[PDB]
Amino acid sequence: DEALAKAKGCMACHAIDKKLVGPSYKDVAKKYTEADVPKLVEKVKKGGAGVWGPVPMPPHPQVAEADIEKIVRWVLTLK
Ligand code: HEC
């Protein structure tokens, strides 16, 4: 949910309705659906670049994959 995203440092680089370093969560929800959850979860975990730009999202080797999936399913409901 939102409190979890913020507890895991996500909202330093992402906001619901505007762009910061990474895409807005509303743009992420517009690009993907619940079909894509497994793919997004790997991206947050392993990090990486190129889908939205050249600046990489760092890996998250110490955030539980269960928590990441929670944040990701919530991101996707922001329409
Ligand atoms: C900067 C220090 C970041 C923090 C911390 C987090 N994210 Fe991020 N994210 C960042 C960038 C620069 C990008 C674009 C990467 C690219 O391919 O261009 C992203 C991307 C995402 C995405 C979209 C993934 C994709 O479309 O391939 C999601 C769903 C996302 N980020 C979620 C997310 C979560 C849940 C974070 C906290 C656990 C998190 N990000 C941190 C920059 C940064």
Ligand 1 probe mutation, 4, 8, 13, 31, most atoms within 8 A of CB? 13
- What does the alpha-carbon distance between residue 37 and residue 62 come to, in Å, rounded to a whole number? 19
Q: What is the resolution of this structure in A?
A: 2.2
Q: Token digits for 40? A: 């997004």
Minimum CA distance residue for ligand 1 atom 38: 10
Angle at 74 between CA 29 and CA 40, to 5 degrees: 60
User: What DSSP letter does each residue of the chain carry, written as one string?
Assistant: -HHHHHHTTGGGT--SSS-SSS--HHHHHHH--GGGHHHHHHHHHH-B-SSS-SSPBPP-TTS-HHHHHHHHHHHTT--
Domain count, the chain: 1
- What does the alpha-carbon distance between residue 56 and residue 22 come to, in Å, rounded to a whole number? 9
Q: How far is the CA of 44 from the centre of ligand 1 (A)?
A: 6
CATH code for position 75: 1.10.760.10
Report the amino acid identity of residue 6. K
> Domain range for residue 21?
1-79
